[PDB]
Design an enzyme around this catalytic site. Structure first.
Site, PDB file in Angstrom:
ATOM      1  N   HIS A   1      25.141   8.438  96.390  1.00  0.00           N
ATOM      2  CA  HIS A   1      24.566   7.201  96.884  1.00  0.00           C
ATOM      3  C   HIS A   1      24.733   7.139  98.401  1.00  0.00           C
ATOM      4  O   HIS A   1      25.711   7.659  98.934  1.00  0.00           O
ATOM      5  CB  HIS A   1      25.214   5.993  96.204  1.00  0.00           C
ATOM      6  CG  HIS A   1      24.609   4.683  96.590  1.00  0.00           C
ATOM      7  ND1 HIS A   1      25.404   3.598  96.918  1.00  0.00           N
ATOM      8  CD2 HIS A   1      23.312   4.350  96.801  1.00  0.00           C
ATOM      9  CE1 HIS A   1      24.567   2.616  97.217  1.00  0.00           C
ATOM     10  NE2 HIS A   1      23.300   3.032  97.193  1.00  0.00           N
TER      11      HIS A   1
ATOM     12  N   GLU B   1      16.564  -4.207  92.147  1.00  0.00           N
ATOM     13  CA  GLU B   1      17.226  -5.426  92.606  1.00  0.00           C
ATOM     14  C   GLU B   1      16.195  -6.437  93.050  1.00  0.00           C
ATOM     15  O   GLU B   1      16.566  -7.489  93.560  1.00  0.00           O
ATOM     16  CB  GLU B   1      18.146  -5.122  93.789  1.00  0.00           C
ATOM     17  CG  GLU B   1      19.516  -4.623  93.382  1.00  0.00           C
ATOM     18  CD  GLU B   1      20.406  -4.301  94.564  1.00  0.00           C
ATOM     19  OE1 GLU B   1      20.486  -5.145  95.486  1.00  0.00           O
ATOM     20  OE2 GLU B   1      21.013  -3.204  94.578  1.00  0.00           O
TER      21      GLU B   1
ATOM     22  N   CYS C   1      22.317  -0.867  92.900  1.00  0.00           N
ATOM     23  CA  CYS C   1      21.640   0.363  93.305  1.00  0.00           C
ATOM     24  C   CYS C   1      21.792   1.472  92.249  1.00  0.00           C
ATOM     25  O   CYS C   1      21.262   2.572  92.430  1.00  0.00           O
ATOM     26  CB  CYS C   1      22.160   0.818  94.671  1.00  0.00           C
ATOM     27  SG  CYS C   1      22.311  -0.507  95.906  1.00  0.00           S
TER      28      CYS C   1
END
Ligand SMILES: CC(C)(COP(=O)(O)OP(=O)(O)OC[C@H]1O[C@@H](n2cnc3c(N)ncnc32)[C@H](O)[C@@H]1OP(=O)(O)O)[C@@H](O)C(=O)NCCC(=O)NCCS
Ligand SMILES: [K+]
Ligand SMILES: [K+]
Ligand code: NA
Ligand SMILES: [Zn+2]
Lengths: 348, 129, 392, 347, 347, 347
Positions: D237, D81, D113
């Site tokens: 995550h 990112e 992500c």
């Protein structure tokens, strides 16, 4: 084991601006610029169009030519230099707009004007490995050139999508092989903050564009054991008309071989859409058994080469969606004022 | 910045020097007279901005900073006192020729980027007559 | 006052050199000169290099130390001489004056330039003009020479067609030069209808920005017989230098380069020669008008009738009864590496007067055995003239 | 053809900042934050470190574990990112920095992500199809959180690299299968102009992160015909510790299964590097025959699931480069002033 | 005799930051800075304070000391380098806030740190010409130094206000004369776009600050036919303590003459408030018949000189509002983190 | 004793852009705009011109008309909304360019479109008090209209300068009196950061422009004991022709009284230069003994009113410099492309 293009689709916005209109504003001789770059005009997106819409139009046209249910598409990749969001992906909005969601993977690709062809290679791998049945790769951009700069004569919007498959009876073209040449080169870049890019000038040409394009062309022909006589048509990256022809002539390609791939004199440089759009026009005209050489280029220092062969199924799909050349000739000209208005180039 | 600061009265007001030994007028002002050397007695002299085009050129491809002005007239003006200066001329490129009477004008000559100093100075304009 | 001669000359290719690193350029010129000279690196008592850029592009000063260090010739003295486009000749002249003194017997005079590395060379080239009173106001280097050309036309009635004839000859001659930046021929229509840089000049009236390097090896005339055969030794009769106002607007007459008149006259006096004896000449033709004017100021013709001299073609290599000017492409077609140009001009005279294998295709006819070079810094603020002869 | 990881590597910068140091400045209760997000401290990059450098450090460590010549790498993908350039690719720098150039393809990947794990899939395809023999996928990010915001407590630096191979003997782990769940969700985004992102708040939680992660978990377990008892370890995550555990517990994973994957409490959210770094720590501890489940998330609304089995060759590779946990404990704490200085958060 | 100060007032925000706190962050030796710049700490405005609020506090204090109805004020001028709006005027807010509106004229003044005193001269003229009865001049600023720069140690917040009158019974001090020295000098500037200024470094000192301050001091003393021995107190511009003292010593002023005027060591440089605040502290201590020399300085190059004599009415008014020194000592220290937070130096 | 104008001057750049050219781009009816705003075209500065150059041209033409040595000018004030520097003063450059340096005071005045007339009052006071012999007041601007907005049709470039003297033999006009009406009003403003302003729309008219202009006109006439019948000519602020005429008609002025003052239809709104330029055109035409009413207006909440009488010396000086109307008619039209190029509206 065998990989190929089952469907392809393209989109170009209607608005154009002639070189004459830009030169007029900046006090330049249009014939000089026109002659030099062999650019006559370029496409301009409507204020309600962007890379996402352009990608969707092309994606949808590719699905028409493929004639397959989008639920079967297992990956969508969008290669652009002008994704609307810095974080939210374009590929996801395109997947939703074709109804490929939710059983798929996707990603937004960045590699200057090579982004589009990077994803074609990604789709090739995933279909070939058997991980997916069909993958879509899109090259689209709404390029913007700096107002005073020469890139303002070429920077343009356009897109093109390709659906990759493994079924023999569905292929309109077949990948014989791919090759890539990549280095670290500071010829052209744009840093996160800046709205307009910075370039190295003449260092962009010989040491970067030619170095990578010709090495990639040489590399694929060594990999395939071929020569310039073996290929029926060719498409190279087209920042300028001049660069494209010099590269083609350098490798020994005649006008008849490279004429179909060169769109920049009337379309401009669509960056990540450039070669994809060129290749799509070659496929619109190509006959069964035609051998194609396609080499892309990306400013960071990269090139993707492809060795393609056309299939008898070509005649059937060509008319299922708008031809690249038809989109290119359906046009509305604008002056420079309206152009800066449309592009949001004026401070507001 | 500092270099701009030193030649302000010259660039802004065209203040040169006059040698009394010779009678000759110098602009830009000189520290040492080329003819008399140390003998030359120098007094500050205010030139009128009036002059004539001695020669000229039209710059079609200048540095990226002069993008708005392109194409512009650069010229060498013979001032009525005698000195010649190099400066731009604010006129249409078709309207310039050798011998045209011109007049100095206070203009924004340059800027050191977005954040640096703005540099003012002379630029010639044709006389109405 | 020892007599000075040139034993050797080495030259890199000129122009857009992307592959060649800066250190490769100086080595490439230096080694080629050493081979022609047939001296060992240890035989060089001192190096004299001139560079106008001075790593304006690179950011590097103290270039002399760097060059000697990388050459591997430490602790020999190396010095950098600067005078804009004339840095080369000035390095040569400094090399001549050390030999003449007797402090050094074998000296290398070199010139090297790298301008491809910077995106805008315009800003550095303009450095030769008065920054406070020309550059400041937007006076580009081509516009200064265009203003010279304009005043010359106004005073002597030179036409654009006449001026453009200088370029077609240059490009024709450059096709016979392997080290030239441009090896193509051009027409009068092509020169005039080229993209304009500064009215009246077009792109085809200007020399290009370019990279390259050239090195000469100077030695004492007596010692020269040790390393080379008498027939391949060329003698430096005189090395003159003069100065003029840095700004063009401060000149007494714009159409002429006084510093060239002053330097050329002094060079003719020491050689005890008239301009009618010069067989071949290399002049600073960065903007074509500079080519006409120097032809007049070196005394090959009277003021004003330069246009007639070229439009007829008197200066061509095929012509017999007149001096042959810039048989190598010259700044226009061979290329213009600011620091190396001053050396290159003289190395061409060396080749021409020694009828070398390098200039076989562009070989001028040598009647009297004399050649002159004129290198200019900026618009004429500095001129350095070198007169060479096959006979001591 | 069977596809698998032949080498993996990771990097974490040395600097840390405790929650207490940030809270102090903004007038918040540190214990409330720590309890809430399940976060104690986060890593900070040096001012001379960026996404590229981290990617290079992790790439280089992966090559050490692979024990192969980088000239054989035929594709380098960097998912981030925070690519230093908006146009010039990071992957090209990494390729040059390990000497895989010039015979390769590369691309910079954007998908919040999830980018990192998206390239793993790309490499899987290219070796599996036979187009290349080795491919590298990197997930790395230098995370910036808005000064006043809660993302300031988690947004962090780090990265991890994976080399994918075709040969059986060289594989240290084997892909049994992959699955992805993607839709269009405006939970979190950043527009081209802006330096800091804008978020949905509560809408990112249950509707977006849980929906995609859980669906991708059932998707892979339906595809593989498995259950949560079949897996030895798991990594999800980890925007914060709270979300990670609620997902693990929801699917029926015990602490022993998910503990290795969760690094955020002492590392923070390394965005694209999060799952890769977690997976790398699982591989540092894993035994032969361990079946692991890895599911990533990306704000735009996608997720990538992996079913991996550990091989005999792990015992050899682990010590060939720095362990994730060792990099994580090699640390130097800073205050908030130095932190804003380092990050260029100053005007 | 005709024109004089009838009321004066001042305001300084409560927050401070020591040099030590800034140096710590940037890796500098605090003692070196303190000795070099002659500064220990500086004022920091609250996040709910700005040049307008500061000006209002000072204006209101000046009205208390004047003991006059604000409806009689016929002009309000505010000289600042940090007006909250680029177009809407501060002076109009201050006029509304003191109830001087609507029968008055006003204007916002710009001339670097000389703006405050510029307006004193304007008020002098208007009252002296008879065009108004009372005029107010304010010099106030919420200066911002660049984070890495040395100006960070001095740039500070403060302001003082002066009411000019014609009534011998109300004058606490009398203008004997004023003088100004102005040139065009590029020592320091800020372009419309930029948030932080650019300076010429050493060119700011001798050729700019000293040139203009000393010429203005010599000009006024020539105008008044006066010497250094004739003045009881003095106040000069104080970018740092170093410059102030060198100027004072250069002219022949002793510590006892210049000490009251110098506030920068514990206040910092308030730019357009600097000399006004110094002069206000001199007036807080001054006795009847005291002669003051006040010389201001502005980059772009200007200086305003004043010759003032203190009147019998001085001690009557001093206690009617807060003394400058009391505002300066009612303080609360902060660290750098809080300081960058307060100043909006955070991105 | 008596204060008056001894010299005046004006400058307008050559470039114009017709309403038709702007409307064409934005899809509006030009005739509707022209009728509504009472504007046909506007002045556009050359890319090498700014408020400083415009001020210098004016200032220099005022000196010609005054026929005095600039060394005698005691202060220079420049009122603008578009000073080239945010900190370095324009007035100093102007002072240096007319050779009034160094024995003078200067300041850059900010008060929207009324800053010009603010300085006239300042010069009136200083001259009248005897503090200076001559003072110069300039009102100049290179206004910016937002591309899409209506202000784009009016915002324009221009300037005028006035020199104030005490001596009857030198005066070409005499101040009978001045009056000002000021409040705090958020009708229009621009924050320090922003390049383009923000406005309140219809709140700008009746509650702000008319409120202040008419109160100031009424106020001056009460102060001076006059009526609309007593005045020969009038000039009001002219954001557009509509507002100007409404105000004039409202007070009872006939076309013959207000026609010379109104320049906006062919010049546009030069902001701080508007009434100065209008007044200069009145002076170009005025006869001895003519009485002028001049009322300015500034967005922050301001209006300055003047009562002026023309003297014998008027016909002597008019031709000594370019007449306002001559500068206004020496023009070159440009399209919108060129205009946005010149004004740097391009990104
Ligand atoms: C126009 C200019 C900038 C040259 O660089 P440019 O913008 O890239 O333009 P071009 O390179 O297309 O110039 C025309 C051609 O002449 C060549 N050329 C360069 N400098 C030249 C010169 N002084 N004279 C003649 N030809 C020249 C260029 O290489 C180019 O060749 P190509 O078309 O085979 O690539 C010129 O003003 C300059 O550099 N001087
Ligand atoms: K991006
Ligand atoms: K301002
Ligand atoms: Na204002
Ligand atoms: Zn003399």
């Amino acid at each position: 084991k065998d990989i190929g293009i089952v469907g392809y689709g393209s989109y170009i916005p209607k608005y154009r601006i002639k070189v004459e209109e830009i030169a007029k504003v900046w006090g330049k001789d249009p014939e000089a610029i026109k002659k030099g770059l062999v650019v006559n005009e370029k496409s301009v997106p409507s204020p309600d169009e962007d890379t996402a819409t352009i990608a969707v139009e092309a994606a949808r046209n590719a699905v028409k030519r493929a004639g397959i249910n989008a639920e079967k598409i297992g990956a969508v990749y969008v290669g652009s230099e002008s994704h609307p969001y810095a974080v939210k992906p374009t590929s996801a909005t395109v997947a939703e707009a074709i109804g490929a969601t939710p059983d798929l993977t996707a990603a937004d690709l960045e590699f200057a004007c090579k982004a589009g062809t990077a994803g074609i290679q990604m789709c090739m791998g995933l279909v070939g490995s058997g991980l997916i049945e069909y993958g879509m790769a899109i090259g689209a951009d709404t390029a913007q050139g700096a107002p005073g700069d020469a890139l303002e004569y070429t920077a343009s919007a356009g897109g093109a999508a390709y659906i990759i498959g493994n079924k023999k009876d569905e292929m309109i073209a077949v990948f014989n092989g791919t090759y890539s040449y990549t280095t670290d080169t500071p010829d052209f870049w744009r840093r996160e903050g800046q709205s307009y890019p910075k370039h190295g000038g003449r260092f962009t040409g010989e040491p970067a564009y030619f170095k990578h394009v010709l090495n990639a062309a040489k590399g694929i022909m060594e990999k395939m054991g071929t020569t310039v006589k073996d290929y029926d048509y060719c498409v190279f990256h087209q920042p300028n008309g001049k660069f494209y022809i010099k590269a083609a002539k350098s490798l020994g390609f005649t006008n008849e071989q490279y004429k179909y791939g060169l769109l920049t004199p009337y379309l401009g440089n669509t960056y990540s859409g450039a070669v994809p759009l060129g290749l799509s026009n070659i496929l619109d005209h190509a006959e069964e058994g035609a051998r194609i050489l396609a080499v892309s280029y990306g400013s960071g220092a990269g090139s993707d080469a492809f060795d393609i062969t056309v299939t008898e199924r070509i005649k059937e799909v060509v008319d299922k969606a708008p031809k690249t050349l038809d989109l290119l000739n359906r046009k509305k000209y604008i002056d420079y004022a309206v152009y800066v208005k449309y592009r949001g180039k004026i401070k507001i | 910045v500092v270099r701009s600061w030193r030649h302000m009265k010259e660039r802004y007001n065209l203040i040169g020097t006059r040698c009394k030994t010779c009678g000759k007028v110098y602009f830009p002002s000189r520290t040492v007279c080329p003819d008399c050397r140390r003998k030359g007695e120098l007094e500050e002299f205010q030139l009128s901005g009036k002059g004539k085009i001695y020669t000229y050129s039209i710059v079609y491809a200048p540095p990226k900073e002069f993008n708005k002005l392109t194409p512009y007239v650069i010229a060498i003006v013979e001032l009525e006192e005698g000195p010649k200066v190099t400066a731009q001329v604010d006129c249409d490129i078709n309207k310039i020729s050798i011998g045209i009477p011109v007049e100095a004008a206070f203009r924004r000559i340059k800027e050191d980027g977005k954040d640096g100093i703005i540099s003012y100075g002379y630029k010639f304009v044709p006389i109405t007559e | 006052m020892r007599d000075v001669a040139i034993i050797g000359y080495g030259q890199t290719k000129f122009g857009e050199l992307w592959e060649d690193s800066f250190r490769d350029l100086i080595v490439e010129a230096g080694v080629k000169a050493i081979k022609d000279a047939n001296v060992d690196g240890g035989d060089i008592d001192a190096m004299y290099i001139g560079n106008m850029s001075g790593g304006l592009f690179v950011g590097q000063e103290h270039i002399a130390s760097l060059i000697a260090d990388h050459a591997g010739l430490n602790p020999v003295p190396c010095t950098r001489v600067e005078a804009a486009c004339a840095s080369g000749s000035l390095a040569l002249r400094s090399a001549v004056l050390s030999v003449a003194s007797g402090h050094h017997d074998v000296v290398l005079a070199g010139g090297v330039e790298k301008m491809t590395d910077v995106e805008d060379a315009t800003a550095a080239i303009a450095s030769a003009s008065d920054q406070e009173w020309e550059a400041f106001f937007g006076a580009t280097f081509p516009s200064l020479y265009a203003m010279m050309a304009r005043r010359y036309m106004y005073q002597y009635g030179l036409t654009i067609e006449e001026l453009s004839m200088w370029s077609v000859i240059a490009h024709e001659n450059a096709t016979k030069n392997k080290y030239a930046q441009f090896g193509f021929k051009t027409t009068l229509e092509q020169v005039m209808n080229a993209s304009p840089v500064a009215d009246p000049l077009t792109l085809m009236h200007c020399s290009p920005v370019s990279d390259g390097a050239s090195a000469l090896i100077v030695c004492d005339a007596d010692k020269a017989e040790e390393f080379a055969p008498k027939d391949e030794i060329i003698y430096i009769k005189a090395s003159t230098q003069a100065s003029d106002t840095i700004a063009l607007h401060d000149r007494e007459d714009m159409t002429t380069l006084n510093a060239a008149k002053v330097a050329s006259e002094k060079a003719y006096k020491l050689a005890k020669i008239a301009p009618e004896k010069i067989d071949v000449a290399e002049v600073h033709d960065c903007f074509a008008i500079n080519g006409l004017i120097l032809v007049e100021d070196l005394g090959f013709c009277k003021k004003g009738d330069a246009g007639k001299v070229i439009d007829e073609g008197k200066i061509r290599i095929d012509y017999d009864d007149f001096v042959t000017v810039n048989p190598s492409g010259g700044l226009k077609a061979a290329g213009h590496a600011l620091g190396a140009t001053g050396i290159r001009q003289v190395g061409e005279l060396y080749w021409q007067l020694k009828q070398d294998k390098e200039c076989k295709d562009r070989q001028a006819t040598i009647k009297n055995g004399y050649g002159i070079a004129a290198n200019v810094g900026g618009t004429g603020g500095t001129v350095c003239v070198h007169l060479l002869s096959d006979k001591r």
